[PDB]
Amino acid sequence: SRRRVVITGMGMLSPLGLDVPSSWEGILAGRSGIAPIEHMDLSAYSTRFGGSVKGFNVEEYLSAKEARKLDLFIQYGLAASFQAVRDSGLEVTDANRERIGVSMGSGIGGLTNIENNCRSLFEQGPRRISPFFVPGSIINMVSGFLSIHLGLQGPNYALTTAQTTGTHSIGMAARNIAYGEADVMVAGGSEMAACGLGLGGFGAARALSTRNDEPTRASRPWDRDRDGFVLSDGSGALVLEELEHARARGARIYAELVGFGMSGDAFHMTAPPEDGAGAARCMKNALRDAGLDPRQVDYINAHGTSTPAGDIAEIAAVKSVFGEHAHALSMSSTKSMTGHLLGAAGAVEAIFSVLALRDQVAPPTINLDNPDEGCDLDLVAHEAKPRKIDVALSNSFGFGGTNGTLVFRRFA
Amino acid sequence: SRRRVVITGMGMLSPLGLDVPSSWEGILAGRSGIAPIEHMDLSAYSTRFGGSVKGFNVEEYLSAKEARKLDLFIQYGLAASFQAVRDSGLEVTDANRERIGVSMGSGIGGLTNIENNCRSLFEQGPRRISPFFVPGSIINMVSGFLSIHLGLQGPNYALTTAQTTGTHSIGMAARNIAYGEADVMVAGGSEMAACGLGLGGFGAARALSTRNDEPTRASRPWDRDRDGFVLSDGSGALVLEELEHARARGARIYAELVGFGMSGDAFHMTAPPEDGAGAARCMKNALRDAGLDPRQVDYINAHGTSTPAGDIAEIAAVKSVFGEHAHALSMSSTKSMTGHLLGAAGAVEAIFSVLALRDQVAPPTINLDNPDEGCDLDLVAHEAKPRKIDVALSNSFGFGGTNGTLVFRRFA
Ligand SMILES: CCC(=O)Nc1nc(C)cs1
């Protein structure tokens, strides 16, 4: 048998705000965090908008000297991790520090730092590359820096599974606790790829909305006028905790993490299969992991990226998995508001799924003005929907055909 | 309930050879694969040598059309994966494809692709960025492309934990099989960071040997004249397999993977503590995991990077863990010959550890002419030592104080 895993702490930077309760207020009001990107010449670029983190103050977390050494994606990781640990009330001691680990990941990592260090390498040669370039940019330094600052000696690692990183990080953090390798983990992801290489990289693949005239309307999952996803920045982080350990110290428990699914499409590098067979296997694996029958699911936080092929495959997968229950469950895409935080997408959407359990409300899919062929499920168009939710799914489907599903259940 | 995990396949690219056997003959013969780098102009760099993969033909594995769009780390990752799966004699069917996953990792990833597309972006503009830039560069696409080529629909992910990547990838892939998430995993890592950003970034942090005039003598772990690590490129992949699944198909079994440890130093972003405290925690967890008396350990394949601080911390860690038995076991650094393949160090060194069990031989530490203060263990200076090896242990340490230990033993 296996230990049960609860959420005792949550932390976040999104395009909707600098913490969870502000972000969530935005989610439930159907606000967009999408706007033209500032302080950057995007003239030669086909996309000029995204979800930026607005008014982030890194000195709330770090000295100016330590923040200077660290990619924006690491600063966002640390902010969310610190918020989450503080949200948990957890106290690290000599007695427990070896039982507390970190799995914070990122899809794309330190592009902003790689751009600046390239600028210097090409203009001036290697001798202007920063000393802190490697340790200030590599993806495992959110885990590394947080572990050093808080004295965490538990499992210390980072995942990079593109747009599935946050979901994988949280699920495999939960595995560490359930099989007794740790009692507490800080898990999620962070991303800042609304930079030249991010917008250029994804623009070159024509993966991005080019709807520059109405940036708030660009992200329209399942709408017949969608034209690709919206690149967004930020971080999610949860404190996962073994249930007995949480009860003993009198922790506030948001929800129980009951199920983790993984699967590979083994199909295509960027495109899912049309029937979502991989997402369907993953969701089944997640429900079996939880010992739940598909009928018990009430809410799904879709991947719902606003790509033609991606949005339709998720409908196919849900119909397949859930048969005569696929219309009963509510399924929204909060990317309609936040855009796609890539590796951080799963972290922030896990939090939104937890808070849909707390508040008994399905968040909206905004911009779903004209559902496409076959998109006839309860996609919670335009407006939040209060309803009964005992069990919430959060899905993530990534490049390389890598899939992740988390199942959260109400704790009482 | 926890299942046993054996090695049925291995595959490799190293500075010593284009596969495992040719690599291994180099290891046993004490050959260096370190040489001035020929593939670029490094006259403006303080380090102008490393461990290149020599004569690599990607068209032994992939069509030119696919290879062109993939970073060398990914080509190297697939070449090792393909070798390993072929060497396992495993056949992939509808019966088993859902039970076969992949976790191939990288510390630094697609830095050549990211540098070249950065060059394109600043000299020309976003219109010259390759459409294949993201899928052909991000770290999780070794696992992705492998899954697409072989039809592996099991758990699909990648770790990025710097110089620990390969050990963590292998260990967590065994935890997948152990806990029943998969029956087979292809796990390891790949690296190709020998570009301007790679040599420059590590050069700017003053971490690299500058012994440009004698590159074969540069990597000298525990020698008093060591002056930094040597940067090397390549790939290690292993087929991990549940024991009864291996027995059921008459798999040839190289050895059993009995033990995995992780720990955080929670000390420093780049420097190990002088006492080897987090390395000691990590080996103690690994040994307890394997249910072993620490006197059972015959051979340690050390991290052994040829840094002043890293090398001595290891002696301390080993002495602290093994007490007087620290004088009986043999410890060596194959990095004396391969140099440091970073996130792939853990993968090729796991294979070296398994081959040390099969051929009953401790590979040498070359260039160990004058061992440093405290470095008084059997470090297998100069020449391979034939000796009894039932239990072999492979250590890795990384930036962010992230530690990994694997324990292998002979299987009969
Ligand atoms: C190491 C992180 C990484 O691969 N990031 C990438 N971003 C792009 C846009 C391509 S590869």
Domain ranges of chain A: 6-259, 260-412
Query: Residue B124 burial (CB < 10 Å; 0-12/13-18/19+)?
Result: exposed
* Interchain contact A175–B (C-beta under 8 A): yes
With a CB cutoff of 8 Å and minimum separation 6, the contacts of A55 are A18
Quick check: B159 and A155 CB within 8 A?
Answer: no
Residue B60 CA to ligand 1 center (angstroms) comes to 27
Pick from B44, B24, B41, B42: nearest CA to B33: B24
> Closest ligand 1 atom, CA of B133?
10
Pick from B410, B373, B363: nearest CA to B390: B410
Residue of A nearest to B198 (CA): A134
List phi, psi (to 5°) of A225. Answer: -105, 10
* Interchain contact A208–B (C-beta under 8 A): no
Residue B134 CA to ligand 1 center (angstroms) comes to 6
Q: Residue B3 in contact with residue B246, Cβ under 8 Å?
A: no
With a CB cutoff of 8 Å and minimum separation 6, the contacts of A273 are A265, A267, A313
Q: Is the CB of A141 under 6 A from ligand 1?
A: no
- Checking phi first, is residue A306 left (phi over 0); if not, alpha (psi -120 to 50) or beta? left
Quick check: B44 and A126 CB within 8 A?
Answer: yes
Q: Residue B187 in contact with residue B80, Cβ under 8 Å?
A: no
HEC states along chain A?
A: CCCCEEEEEEEEEECCECCHHHHHHHHHHCCCCEEECCCCCCCCCCCCEEECCCCCCHHHCCCHHHHCCCCHHHHHHHHHHHHHHHHHCCCCCCCCHHHEEEEEECCCCCHHHHHHHHHHHHHHCHHHCCCCCCCCCCCCHHHHHHHHHHCCCCCEECECCHHHHHHHHHHHHHHHHHCCCCCEEEEEEEECCCCHHHHHHHHHCCCECCCCCCHHHCCCCCECCCCCECEECEEEEEEEEEHHHHHHCCCCCCEEEEEEEEEECCCCCCCCCCCCHHHHHHHHHHHHHCCCCHHHCCEEECCCCCCHHHHHHHHHHHHHHHHHHCCCCEEECCHHHHCECHHHHHHHHHHHHHHHHHHCEECCECCCCCECCCCCCECCECCCEECCCCEEEEEEEECCCEEEEEEEECCC
Pick from B305, B299, B231: nearest CA to B73: B231
C-alpha distance from A22 to closest chain B C-alpha (Å): 31
* Interchain contact B206–A (C-beta under 8 A): yes
* Interchain contact B117–A (C-beta under 8 A): yes
* Whole-number Å distance between alpha carbons of B9 and A401: 24
* Whole-number Å distance between alpha carbons of A230 and B58: 35
Name the experiment that determined this structure: X-ray
Residue A109 CA to ligand 1 center (angstroms) comes to 6
HEC states along chain B?
A: CCCCEEEEEEEEEECCECCHHHHHHHHHHCCCCCEECCCCCCCCCCCCEEECCCCCCHHHCCCHHHHCCCCHHHHHHHHHHHHHHHHCCCCCCCCCHHHEEEEEECCCCCHHHHHHHHHHHHHCCHHHCCCCCCCCCCCCHHHHHHHHHHCCCCCEECECCHHHHHHHHHHHHHHHHHCCCCCEEEEEEEECCCCHHHHHHHHHCCCECCCCCCHHHCCCCCECCCCCECEECEEEEEEEEEHHHHHHCCCCCCEEEEEEEEEECCCCCCCCCCCCHHHHHHHHHHHHHCCCCHHHEEEEECCCCCCHHHHHHHHHHHHHHHHHHHHCCEEECCHHHHCECHHHHHHHHHHHHHHHHHHCEECCECCCCCECCCCCCCCCECCCEECCCCEEEEEEEECCCEEEEEEEECCC
This PDB structure is determined at a resolution in Å of: 2.2
> Closest ligand 1 atom, CA of B160?
1
Q: Residue A397 in contact with residue A403, Cβ under 8 Å?
A: yes
Quick check: B115 and A115 CB within 8 A?
Answer: no
Q: Is the CB of B134 under 6 A from ligand 1?
A: yes
Strand-pair category, A330-332 with A34-36 = unpaired
C-alpha distance from A243 to closest chain B C-alpha (Å): 20
Q: Closest to B264 (Cβ–Cβ): which among A101, A131, A164?
A: A101
Q: Closest to B157 (Cβ–Cβ): which among A135, A152, A159?
A: A159
Residues 390-409 of B with CB under 8 A from A: 398-403
* Interchain contact B125–A (C-beta under 8 A): yes
Task: Take atom 6 of ligand 1 and give the residue whose Cα is closest.
Answer: A108
Residue A368 CA to ligand 1 center (angstroms) comes to 31
> Closest ligand 1 atom, CA of B110?
4
Q: Is the CB of B101 under 6 A from ligand 1?
A: no
Strand-pair category, B391-398 with B297-301 = parallel
Quick check: B154 and A278 CB within 8 A?
Answer: no
